[PDB]
Design a protein around this ligand. Sequence first.
Ligand SMILES: O=C(O)c1cccnc1Nc1c(Cl)ccc(OCc2ccccc2)c1Cl
Ligand SMILES: O=C(O)c1cccnc1Nc1c(Cl)ccc(OCc2ccccc2)c1Cl
Ligand SMILES: [Cl-]
Ligand SMILES: [Cl-]
Lengths: 466, 460
Amino acid sequence: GEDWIFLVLLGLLMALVSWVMDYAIAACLQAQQWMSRGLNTSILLQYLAWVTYPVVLITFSAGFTQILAPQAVGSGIPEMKTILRGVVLKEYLTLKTFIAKVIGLTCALGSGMPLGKEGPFVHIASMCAALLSKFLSLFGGIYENESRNTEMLAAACAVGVGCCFAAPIGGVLFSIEVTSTFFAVRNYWRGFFAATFSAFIFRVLAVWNRDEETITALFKTRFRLDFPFDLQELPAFAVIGIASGFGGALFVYLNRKIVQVMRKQKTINRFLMRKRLLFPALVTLLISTLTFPPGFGQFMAGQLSQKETLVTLFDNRTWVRQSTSQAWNPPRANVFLTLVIFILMKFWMSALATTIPVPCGAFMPVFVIGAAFGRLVGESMAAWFPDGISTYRIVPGGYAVVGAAALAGAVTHTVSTAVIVFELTGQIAHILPVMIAVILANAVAQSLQPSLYDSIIRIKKLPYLP
Amino acid sequence: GEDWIFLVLLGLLMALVSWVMDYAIAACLQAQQWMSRGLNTSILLQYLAWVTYPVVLITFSAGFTQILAPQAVGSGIPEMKTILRGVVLKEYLTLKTFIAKVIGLTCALGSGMPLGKEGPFVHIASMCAALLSKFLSLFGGIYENESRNTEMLAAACAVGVGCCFAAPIGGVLFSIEVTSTFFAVRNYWRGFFAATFSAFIFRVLAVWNRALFKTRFRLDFPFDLQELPAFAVIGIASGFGGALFVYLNRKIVQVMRKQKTINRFLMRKRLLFPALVTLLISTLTFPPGFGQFMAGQLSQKETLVTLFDNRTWVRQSTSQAWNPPRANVFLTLVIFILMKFWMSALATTIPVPCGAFMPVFVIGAAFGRLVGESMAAWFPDGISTYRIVPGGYAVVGAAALAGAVTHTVSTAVIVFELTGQIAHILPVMIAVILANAVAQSLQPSLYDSIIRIKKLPYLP
Ligand SMILES: O=C(O)c1cccnc1Nc1c(Cl)ccc(OCc2ccccc2)c1Cl
Ligand SMILES: O=C(O)c1cccnc1Nc1c(Cl)ccc(OCc2ccccc2)c1Cl
Ligand SMILES: [Cl-]
Ligand SMILES: [Cl-]
């Protein structure tokens, strides 16, 4: 069957495209730190370099995107949910939109702005499906139909999320929850088949490389295997779920409220529609200025990238017991204050930064806010019970995994975040805690606000089935 | 909200029912061992006790089923697939059918017979859902909607498979793949909710009155990239074997229909078929006789716990059962595989409440362990500081053959929750995908094959 040649080529090309983008994003983030370490000659020369380099990468991302393909701003998922519902869009799967996203996303993330890649990876995979089916001319000529287009793009959304999180089953399951309302079991088998082939290519690349480029071997946790938690502390993992449900409902509300204000302020909007590159540059300058380590970044671990922040929050050691915890315990504050200020600052910075005219997603931004809030509860438990909830003392890094999944699930309207965190953290010992928090987060988030992508659909005035 | 009160109570009742049944099955299997070791002075009395005890339990299970509810016979997935397509079955969700499935399955599994409970748990959970939805005051001709009822029967399949395997996510994904053609996202959220409340009650009971198959392999370099062809061969060979099982089951049912004089002779004296097949299996399972050459002294749980063992056996514990003084590990695994294959295809046809997942999962574990131990014999120092892990190949082969028989891929998710580890994920998915690609090209699912055999409303 020709469809099983299509799905191995769709799985091969998205693994290469993901690995090439990740190599280019890392080189951009490393150059910021090298430049800072070089320019320790004066605080003003170090500050000038810290604010300038992000603003140059974001200004180039917005300008280059506007020149090739103005359709390439924002996330794929809220359009793909309408393309699979049978609605044609103007230029969306064309090679100019591919070139615009692969270059424009690499500059948006390499700036060090608080931005995700999931929605963009769903669009880039769908463009690989479309452009593949024409480069080898499988489409049009031989009994081809809109049904076969929708069936090949649905497996591409599954490969898109699967390559993003390095989570081959949880990516297939997440794609179904966000793009669809009924899914064929035959389409879940085709997603699972192509996702498994993308996973195989990542192991070959990682074996040919020095390491997994996904730090700590794809965020692999190293907690104890025996008595990792007690039934006496299930009431704490439940309060993470509920609070993450309210938190994710506020994030989606605030992001829509920001866009509605920029549309309602018509005089400023007319000025900015002439001055098209001004708004993305000013937002980048503000965020980089507050993240400046010698000024205010010391109270937010501002010197860390988004990988480095999450690798630190998932450590097996306890911080409140009297390697990178040093970024959370500066000479002027304790770890609890630094967690509370990081949570409060990253919340408004991430609801704002995702509105700017660049290719960007939003899942890693809410995943790290959730991990920090989970770690705040975990260290607070380890401080209240210093030697046992007897003999088995508390493990705060396992509370961070539960908070990550619970806030990401509330914002997304999803339960496959539970499956992703097992494949990602490399362990299953916290399964019951994760599933209680994730279902409590969804039970109250779905009672308060739509999903993030359903807000983006209604903001963009795409055709909506509630 | 009435839907969450229902999905809490359904998660509580199926977990309580599952626990009381596993207590009663373990008691019946302990009685067999006590009675056997109490007779170690007389081989003849020990053989008489060994074949009589299971023949009595099966004869009672068949007889008690045929008195209360003949519709309670066999695996309940094919009828639930048919009822979820909107076909009506007469008395298939009633209290007589429940009592017959609960007691009949307890007696059928409390015996050495190669039977499972996956299909019976899908039926028992659907009876709990019917009884709860009949009990609650929102029952009546204004609100007994077929949509409401079909929505809860779809969640009850997920609770039943979740309680069966003790795999709360994998049990929802398997229920979708076997009972449905469209994965509705709103019902996959209900399956996850109700499977969570059962997993909580299971741990509360595991404190106050005390998955079970948890493994302890390396976290560092458990397999090399040089080994993926051996996990692929397991998937390919597991595709042909999983197709052969569905064919062999159907041929056995067609032959007992075909031969008219034998058919009518047995149908007049209905208990002679389940009694005489139990007697032949028990006679071959008798340990001082032939049974030592197929580990006949272990139960199904005790067998599977030895197959997932973290040591290599071919280096040259209950796992000694695979190496009697007269035969090695390999010969005992090959004899086990071939004898269990025909015994399980046959035993799942007999007139008692029985499923078929554990019998195929165990043959896959022995076939996987056989390939793992072959690799560990061929590569004594690694494919170095790192040696091969044969118990990981047993997890791969067990996941692949259960997927090829059932036409599912979510046996990959089940195996990580059972084993408590996710390090073998790439090997498992490659073996499962090869096993389904090879099997779907040859035969229907075991459950579709039963729909054809039973002349139910098929839909390819
Ligand atoms: O931060 C860095 O140093 C970095 C370096 C190289 C490449 N990417 C980096 N970061 C990054 C960002 Cl900004 C957004 C998304 C993301 O996707 C995977 C993922 C994994 C788990 C949860 C949620 C998303 C990654 Cl890995
Ligand atoms: O054998 C015993 O000593 C035993 C004692 C008490 C209760 N059950 C026992 N066995 C058993 C049987 Cl017969 C059928 C099904 C099953 O579980 C579902 C499952 C679990 C893992 C893999 C694949 C299926 C179990 Cl655990
Ligand atoms: Cl992301
Ligand atoms: Cl079973």
